Design a protein around this ligand. Structure first.
Ligand SMILES: Nc1ncnc2c1ncn2[C@H]1CC[C@@H](COP(=O)(O)OP(=O)(O)OP(=O)(O)O)O1
Ligand SMILES: [Mg+2]
Ligand SMILES: [Mg+2]
Length: 344
């Protein structure tokens, strides 16, 4: 059976709690307020916005000592042709030392800030364009849709459009699709391209095309992976796993049970050839098509993950096909564990 109310309860159990959500919002709000009011940075900071699975509503509850993550993108007007990625990032060290002394560390492409209730990631970016195109892009990045403090599931009317306010549609692709930001890579010492706004937009659109089920299916698959982590490779996880899920899921999803079985079956058939080749697929990033989201995933890890999905899919199919509530819920619980409730 589909057991829609049981899936609803399961999803309530695996979302970040209200306390964690408030902690995410508070940490991000305080960081962005401090940046906005910091005088030595006012001439270079164009705007800031939220990226991360919490912003996209694809994150699961942290367990144990783990805390929610906020990924903050700082959009600057620095000239990436004349300033090194290291110097661009170094411009932000007095801010961190003033407000988060002893709690921040330099990472490859970002700064990490560790508080007791939240982890913050500060990504410095620059706009490669110039002139009128740069001004149009900056007006996009200063809009309400980019500055929003809300997660994706909290505002279904959100669109990537400078006219949106909390029905407009996404702006035309010609205005943003070929306009990634650049971001430092200190380990490579070069500016790379990144397009978080395109990823967020794609996620929101896919969730609409799937009747709100996409982000919940991402959460469910992440929970399944966590509950079966000793039987699975460590990778894929996080965003590459989300991306695989969004690739496998068809538009038009009508229920969690149906969508799970469909995306697992499609995953298994679509990648059967590459699995038998003992290879891994290329999947282009939304926004930067030249980038392989699976670049760091090994073929061995992909093939192990694929076998994990094949095993899970047999259970999921029998769970969906079962005509008895208790048997169906027991099969679903074999996938997801005790957070999936038995029907009363
Ligand atoms: N392989 C990849 N390809 C393209 N973009 C990527 C990427 N990995 C990350 N990004 C982009 C997407 C947003 C940004 C931060 O990604 P996090 O590593 O924080 O992954 P998040 O989705 O937040 O999952 P979490 O593990 O945190 O639950 O970098
Ligand atoms: Mg994250
Ligand atoms: Mg698809």
């Amino acid at each position: 059976m589909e057991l829609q109310p049981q899936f609803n309860e399961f999803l309530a159990n695996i979302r970040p709690t209200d306390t964690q959500k408030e902690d995410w919002k508070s940490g991000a709000r305080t960081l962005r307020e401090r940046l906005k009011n910091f005088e030595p940075l006012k001439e270079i900071v164009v705007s800031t916005f939220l990226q991360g699975s919490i912003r996209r509503s694809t994150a699961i509850r942290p367990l144990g000592d783990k805390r929610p993550d906020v990924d903050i993108v700082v959009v600057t007007n620095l000239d990436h042709t004349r300033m090194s990625p290291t110097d661009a990032m170094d411009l932000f060290i007095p801010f961190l030392e003033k407000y988060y002394p002893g709690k921040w560390e330099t990472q490859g492409r970002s700064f990490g800030i560790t508080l007791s209730y939240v982890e913050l990631d500060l990504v410095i970016t620059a706009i490669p364009e110039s002139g009128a195109e740069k001004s149009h892009l900056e007006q996009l990045y200063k809009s309400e849709s980019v500055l929003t403090v809300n997660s994706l599931e909290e505002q279904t009317d959100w669109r990537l459009n400078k006219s949106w306010t909390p029905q407009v549609e996404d702006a035309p692709a010609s205005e943003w699709k070929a306009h990634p930001l650049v971001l430092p890579d200190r380990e490579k010492n070069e500016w790379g391209r990144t397009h978080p706004l395109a990823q967020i937009r794609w996620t929101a659109e896919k969730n609409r095309l799937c009747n709100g089920h996409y982000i919940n299916l991402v959460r469910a698959v992440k929970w399944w992976r966590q509950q079966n982590s000793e039987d699975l490779p460590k990778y894929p996880k996080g965003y590459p796993l989300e991306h695989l899920i969004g690739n496998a899921l068809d538009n038009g999803t009508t229920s969690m049970a149906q969508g799970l079985v469909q995306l697992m079956d499609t995953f298994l058939s679509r990648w059967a050839a590459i699995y038998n080749q003992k290879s891994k697929p290329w999947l282009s990033d939304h926004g930067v098509a030249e980038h392989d989201v699976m670049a760091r995933l090994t073929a061995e890890d992909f093939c192990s993950f694929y076998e994990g999905i094949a095993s899970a899919a047999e259970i999921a199919r029998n769970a969906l096909a079962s005509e008895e509530p208790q048997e169906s819920a027991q099969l679903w619980r074999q996938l997801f564990g005790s957070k999936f409730p038995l029907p009363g």
